[PDB]
Design a protein around this ligand. Sequence first.
Ligand SMILES: CCCCCCCCCCCCCC(=O)O
Lengths: 90, 91
Amino acid sequence: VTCGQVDANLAPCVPFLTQGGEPGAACCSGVKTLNGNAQSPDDRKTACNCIKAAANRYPNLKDDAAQSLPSKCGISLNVPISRTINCDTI
Amino acid sequence: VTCGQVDANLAPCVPFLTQGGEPGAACCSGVKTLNGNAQSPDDRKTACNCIKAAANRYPNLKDDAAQSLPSKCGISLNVPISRTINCDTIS
Ligand SMILES: CCCCCCCCCCCCCC(=O)O
């Protein structure tokens, strides 16, 4: 996994992550793809740092949307979406 | 490249990165390895964020030691080592 595919996977989540509402089919599909590429702990740490960068790309980001995405998509997201996560814990 | 490889390659650089002086042979070897695994720009951004994490792992780290590591090792590191870099800016 690489930061560029992570960016690609989360691009359709930008509306939900910045304006709220519901993530939608494309967002959840991208998140599922990314969760599938983040199976091992190494992959998970790399994806976590990539996601931290993507999350920090937007100051308008809503923490409640980021925190509710995994349950709104019905996925056990191994990598949380936050601007302040320390990816060494993953 | 992956964050675990970044951690492993930079582990022998921790003494220089926290107390200064000169990087050991193993440190410079790890840095050259990392320069070699980061061929594409995607690779470079991934390595940059991994390196940001590793750099933030110790606040006792000296940022100037991090900035001087590649030239002290005599290698042009295509990816900068910083605790506060926004990795979207790099090429
Ligand atoms: C000109 C940019 C190409 C299209 C990407 C849109 C950039 C703004 C983000 C708006 C949300 C788009 C989500 C999506 O990719 O479906």
